[model samples]
Target: AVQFSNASYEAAILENLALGTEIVRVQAYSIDNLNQITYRFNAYTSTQAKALFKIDAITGVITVQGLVDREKGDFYTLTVVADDGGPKVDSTVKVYITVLDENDNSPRFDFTSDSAVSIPEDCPVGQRVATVKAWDPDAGSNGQVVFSLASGNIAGAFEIVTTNDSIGEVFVARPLDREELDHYILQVVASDRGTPPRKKDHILQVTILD
Candidate 1:
C-alpha cells in the first residue's frame, strides 16, 4: 500500500506569472510486506503546454516549467501515480489547482464616510453600537474578511463577534468611555487560505461625541 501526506491541493497564480511560482509539492510513502523495493512517480497535466510540468525522476519531485493563464480556466487538474518495484503495489492521487484573484477592486465600506454613533459613557457592558464591514473581490477563502482594532488602541475594552462567511459584522464589546478614549480606529483584513494566502486590509476611524 502507498499513501500521500497531502493528497489533494490547490494554488493560485496571477496571469503571466512564472510557473515555478505556482508549483505544488506533495510527499509520498510506500508501505508493503516486501523488502528491497524502489518507488517511482508519474505525473501529467490536463492543459498541454510547450513545457507545462517537470518532474525529478530520481527524487520524484514535480514542478511546472512554464507560465499559466487565468483565462484558460482558473484551475488545473493533475494526476499523480506512485508505484513500487514489488508487484501489486501502486497508488494514485488527484490534485486541483486554483488561480487567485488580483486586487483590481474598489474599496467598499459598510458604513458611510464620516459616520458617527454615540454611546453613553456609563452604558452597560456588551452594548452593541456600530459595526464595520468590508469585502474582497477575490473568490473562495480569499474574499473572507476579519476585523481588528488599530494599533495603539486598547483592545480589552472592545471585542469583535465571530465572523460568518455569508454575513459580515463588527460589534462593540463594552461601554464607551469618552474620557479614557475620545476616538477609536478599527482595521479589517481579508485573506485567502490557498497555498499562499492573499490578504487585504482596511481602516475605520470612529470618534466619540460628547
Candidate 2:
C-alpha cells in the first residue's frame, strides 16, 4: 500500500505571487520500498485549486499556475493522490492554501460629486453638516482610509472630523454668512494607509440657505 508522509499540508502565499512560484511539496513512500510512486492531483475534487495551481507528477511539487486574487478566493484545498502503478489502494493528502492580501484596490467614495447639499446659514460652529463614507477592499492597513479637506476651504470655514477610518464628518469650523458666500465648493480626498497610497478626490458643493 502507498502511504503519504503526512495526511495534510498547509501553506500561504501573497495574492500578488508571481506565476510559477513554488509553494510546497509532498512525499509518499511505497511500503515494499521498491514500488515506483507517482503523484497527481484529484482534478475532480480539487477543481478550484487545480485552476490556480499545478503539481509535479513525479516530485509532488506545487506551483502557482494562474493569478491568485485574494478578493475573489482567499482559501483553497487540494486533494493529492499517490499511486504505485499496482493493484494497491492509492493514498491521498489534503493541501490547504491561504492567499494573503495586497494593496491592489483603491479607496472609493459612496457618494458622487454631481449632487449638491443645502446647509442653513444659522447653523452654529462645529455643527456637522455632511458625513462622507469611503472604503477599500484590501486587508489590514492597506484598506485603512483617511479623509481630509484637500482644497477649496478658502477661509478655513469648514473642518473634516474622522471619528473612524471609513467615515468623515464635515463640520462648520467657523460661521457661515450667505452675504459673504452663497455657495461653498469643497474638494474632499480619501486616501488609503498603504505604501504608495491610493487616493480619490471628490467635490462637495454646499449651498448656504437663508
* lDDT for residue 35 in candidate 2, whole number 0-100: 70
Cα lDDT of model 2 by residue, 1-210, tens digit: 667778789898999788899999999987575776787887655577788999898988999999899988999988888867777788888999999988998888886323367988888997988888888888888899888888888788899876567887889999899999989889988899899899988788899998
TM-score of 2: 0.83
Model 2 misplacement above 4 A? 1-7, 31-35, 111-115
lDDT of each: 0.55, 0.85
Q: Estimate each model's TM-score.
A: 0.43, 0.83
**For model 1, how does the per-residue alpha-carbon lDDT over 138-193 read when each residue is reduced to its tens digit?**
45555555444545346565565535542234455666788889776665544444
Which pairs of residues have clashing backbones in candidate 1?
none
Worst 10 residues of 2 by lDDT: 108-117
